[PDB]
């Protein structure tokens, strides 16, 4: 029921309820000639939703708004991007302009400027060390080290113990590693470690592409990684 790379056309975005008030949303994405399925989060908070990560580009975000109008019909009023690549940032422009706050950590910012990639505005604190933990509204945001990029973070709902791993966790069809050009493959596995340290009992794992699955999700990315590791 969840849907598939193959059913999305680029341009459209699909959402998906999980739990009560908790939907993930599913964008594609064309790369060097490849489509690429690509997950977010939205989380209801109280009247209000809590976004996370943008749908990859403006032309998906701002689809994504107009799915989020019709469909649920509460306004986005904060936003988080997960880590600084296109696929979490792609589309913050359009956020702001919608009156949304956008919000990453510093590192996360600093990275987007660098990569001249688009900026959220707001700073979170209190994600600067590996482990640390702090409350966002609805969800729990968790920095567990260094992975798929130095500044990657996770999500966590306690409401209906959903895991956002974002593109830290790979999807169980994905058996060799993606585009690895700003990841820490050395402390890959040992932030995965944190997180299944830290979130035990999730329920429902929902990686940064593709489809979501239960922790199992964490030791297949740990495996992939050292795979790739030991090219
Ligand atoms: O494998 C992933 O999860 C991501 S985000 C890969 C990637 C990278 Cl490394 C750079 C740039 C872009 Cl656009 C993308 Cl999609
Ligand atoms: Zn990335
Ligand atoms: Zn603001
Ligand atoms: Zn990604």
Known sequence: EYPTVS?????????????????????????????????GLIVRDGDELLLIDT???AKNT?????????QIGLPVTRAVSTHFHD???G???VLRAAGVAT???????????????????????????SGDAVRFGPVELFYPGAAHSTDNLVVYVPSASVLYGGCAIYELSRTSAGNVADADLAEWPTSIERIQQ?????????????????????????????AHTNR
């Open 7 to 39: 059913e999305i056309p680029v341009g459209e975005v699909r959402l998906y309820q999980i739990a009560d008030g908790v939907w993930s949303h599913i964008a594609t994405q064309s790369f060097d000639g490849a489509v690429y399925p690509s997950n």
């Open 55 to 57: 749908a990859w580009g």
């Open 62 to 70: 701002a689809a994504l708004l107009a799915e989020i109008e019709k």
């Open 87 to 89: 696929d979490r940032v």
């Open 91 to 93: 589309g913050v422009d």
């Open 103 to 129: 919000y990453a950590s510093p590192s996360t910012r600093r990275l987007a400027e660098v990569e001249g990639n688009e900026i959220p505005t707001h700073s979170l604190e209190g994600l600067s060390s």
């Open 198 to 226: 830290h979130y035990p009992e999730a329920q429902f794992v929902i990686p940064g592409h593709g489809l979501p699955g239960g922790l199992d999700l964490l030791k297949h990315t740990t495996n992939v990684v050292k």
